[PDB]
Chains A and B, each alone.
Chain A
Amino acid sequence: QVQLQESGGGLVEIGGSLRLSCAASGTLFTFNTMAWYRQAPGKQREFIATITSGGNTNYADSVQGRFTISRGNAKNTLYLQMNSLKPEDTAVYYCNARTMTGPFDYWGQGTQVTV
Chain B
Amino acid sequence: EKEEAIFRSAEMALVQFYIPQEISRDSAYTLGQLGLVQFRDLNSKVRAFQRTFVNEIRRLDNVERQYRYFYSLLKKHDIKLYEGDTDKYLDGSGELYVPPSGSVIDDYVRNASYLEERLIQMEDATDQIEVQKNDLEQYRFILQSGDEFFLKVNYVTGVIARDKVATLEQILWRVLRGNLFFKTVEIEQPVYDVKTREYKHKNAFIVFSHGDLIIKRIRKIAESLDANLYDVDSSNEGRSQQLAKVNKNLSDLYTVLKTTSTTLESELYAIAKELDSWFQDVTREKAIFEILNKSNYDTNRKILIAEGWIPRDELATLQARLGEMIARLGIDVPSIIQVLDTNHTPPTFHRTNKFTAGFQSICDCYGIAQYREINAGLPTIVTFPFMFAIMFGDMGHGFLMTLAALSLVLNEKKINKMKRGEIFDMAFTGRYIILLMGVFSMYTGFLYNDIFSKTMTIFKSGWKWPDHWKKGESITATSVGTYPIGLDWAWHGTENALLFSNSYKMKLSILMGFIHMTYSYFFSLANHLYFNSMIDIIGNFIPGLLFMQGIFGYLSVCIVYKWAVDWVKDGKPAPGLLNMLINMFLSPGTIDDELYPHQAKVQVFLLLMALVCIPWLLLVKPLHFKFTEDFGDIMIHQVIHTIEFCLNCVSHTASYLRLWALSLAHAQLSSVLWTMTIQIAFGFRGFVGVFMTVALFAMWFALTCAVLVLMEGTSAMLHSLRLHWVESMSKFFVGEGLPYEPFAFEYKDMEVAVA
Q: Is the CB of A73 within 8 A of B476?
A: yes
Question: Quick one: closest B residue to A25, CB to CB?
Answer: B472
Interface size on B, residues (CB 8 A): 8
Q: B476, A23: Cβ atoms under 8 Å? A: no
Chain B residues whose C-beta falls within 8 Å of the C-beta of A42 in the assembled complex: none
Q: Give the contacting residue for A76; candidates B469, B471, B474, B476; CB below 8 A.
A: B474
Cβ-based interface call for B328 (8 A): no
Q: Tell me the residues in window 456-508 of chain B with beta carbons closer than 8 Å to chain A beta carbons.
A: 469-476
Q: Is A109 an interface residue (CB 8 A)?
A: no
Are B473 and A25 in contact (CB-based, < 8 A)?
Answer: yes
C-alpha gap A5/B473 in the complex (Å):
10
A43 to chain B, nearest CB (A): 29
Per DSSP, chain B at the interface is loop
- Complex CA gap A30/B469 in Å reads 18
Minimum distance in angstroms from A31 CB to a CB of chain B: 12
Residues of A within 8 A of B475 (CB): 74
- B474 A7 Cβ-Cβ under 8 A: no
State the Cβ distance, A3 to closest chain B Cβ, in Å.
Answer: 8
Q: Chain B 563-584 against A: per-residue CB contact (8 Å), 1 yes, 0 no? A: 0000000000000000000000
For B474, the chain A residues whose CB sits under 8 A away are 23, 25, 74-77
With an 8 A cutoff between CB atoms, is A26 at the interface?
yes
Q: How far is the CB of B257 from chain A (nearest CB, A)?
A: 88
Cα distance A77–B476 when bound, in Å? 12
In the bound complex, CA of A73 to CA of B465 (Å) = 13
Complex CA–CA separation, A8 to B469 (angstroms): 13
A74 touches B476 (CB 8 A): yes
Q: Report chain B residues within 8 Å CB of A74.
A: 473-476
Report the bound CA distance from A77 to B473 in whole Å: 8
Q: Which of B430-473 contact A (CB under 8 A)?
A: 469-473
Given the complex, which residues of A lie within 8 Å of B469, measured CB to CB?
A: 23
Smallest beta-carbon distance B197→chain A, Å: 75
Determine whether the beta carbon of A25 is less than 8 Å from that of B476: no
| Closest B residue to A2 using CB positions | B472
Chain A hits for B476, CB < 8 A: 73-74
Give the chain B neighbours of A7 by CB distance below 8 A: 470
Within 8 A of B (CB), among A48-85: 73-77
CA distance A17 to B210 in the complex (A): 128
Q: How far is the CB of B469 from chain A (nearest CB, A)?
A: 8
Mask, A16-38, CB within 8 Å of B = 1, is 00000001011000000000000
Complex CA distance for A75 and B495, rounded to whole angstroms: 12
Residue of A nearest to B474 (CB): A74
Closest to A28 in B: B495
How far, in Å, is B446 (CB) from chain A's closest CB? Answer: 32
Per the bound structure, the CA–CA distance linking A3 and B470 in Å amounts to: 11
Q: Say how far B235's CB is from chain A's closest CB, in angstroms.
A: 98
> In whole Å, how far is A73's beta carbon from the nearest beta carbon of chain B?
5
* Distance, CA A46 to CA B469, complexed state (A): 28
Tell me the complex Cα distance, A74–B471, Å: 14
CB distance from A63 to the nearest CB of B (A): 25
B-side contacts of A23, CB under 8 Å: 469-470, 472-474
Shortest Cβ distance from B474 into chain A, in angstroms?
4
CA distance A75 to B476 in the complex (A): 10
Q: How far is the CB of B397 from chain A (nearest CB, A)?
A: 33
Cα–Cα distance between A75 and B496 once the two chains are bound (Å):
13
Contacts of A25 in B (CB 8 A): 470-474
Identity of the chain A residue whose Cβ is nearest the Cβ of B471 in the assembled complex: A25
From A26, which residue of chain B is reached at the shortest CB distance?
A: B472
Q: Report the Cα distance A23→B474, complex, angstroms.
A: 8
Q: Which chain B residue lies CB-closest to A76?
A: B474
- Residues in chain A near residue B473, CB distance under 8 A: 23, 25, 74, 77
In the complex, what distance in Å separates the CA atom of A62 from the CA atom of B472? 34
Measured between beta carbons, the chain B residues less than 8 angstroms from A75 are 474
Q: Which chain A positions have C-beta within 8 A of B470?
A: 5, 7, 23, 25
CA distance A7 to B473 in the complex (A): 13
A94 CA / B626 CA spacing, docked (Å): 91
Q: Which residues from B are CB-within-8-Å of A76?
A: 474
Report how far A25 CA is from B470 CA in the complex, Å: 9
Q: How far is the CA of A76 from the CA of B475 in the complex (A)?
A: 10
Whole-angstrom distance between the alpha carbons of A77 and B471 in the complex? Answer: 12
Determine the distance from Cα of A75 to Cα of B474 in the docked complex, in whole angstroms. 6
The docked-state distance in angstroms from the alpha carbon of A76 to that of B472 is: 11
CA distance A3 to B268 in the complex (A): 92
Q: Tell me the nearest residue of chain A to B475, going by C-beta.
A: A74
CB A2 to nearest CB in B, in angstroms, measures 9
Chain B residues positioned under 8 Å from A5 (CB to CB): 470-471
**Closest B residue to A30 using CB positions:** B474
Q: How far is the CA of A26 from the CA of B475 in the complex (A)?
A: 14
CA A7 – CA B475 in complex, angstroms?
17
> When chains A and B are docked, how far (Å) is the Cα of A76 from the Cα of B474?
8
Chain A contacts for B471, CB-based, 8 A? 5, 25
Complex Cα spacing A74 to B476, Å:
7
- Of all chain B residues, the one with the shortest Cβ separation from A3 is B472
Q: In the complex, A75→B469 CA distance in Å?
A: 13
How distant is the Cα of A62 from the Cα of B469 in the complex, in angstroms?
Answer: 31
The CA-CA distance from A5 to B470 in the complex, in Å, is 8
* B-binding residues in A (CB < 8 A): 3, 5, 7, 23, 25-26, 73-77
Jot down 7 A-B pairs with beta carbons below 8 A, ordered by A. Answer: A23-B470, A25-B474, A74-B476, A75-B474, A76-B474, A77-B473, A77-B474
**Additional pairs, 11, CB under 8 Å, beyond known A3-B472, A25-B472, A74-B474:** A5-B470, A5-B471, A23-B469, A23-B472, A23-B473, A23-B474, A25-B471, A26-B472, A73-B476, A74-B473, A75-B474
Closest 6 CB pairs of A and B: A25-B472, A74-B474, A23-B473, A75-B474, A23-B470, A73-B476
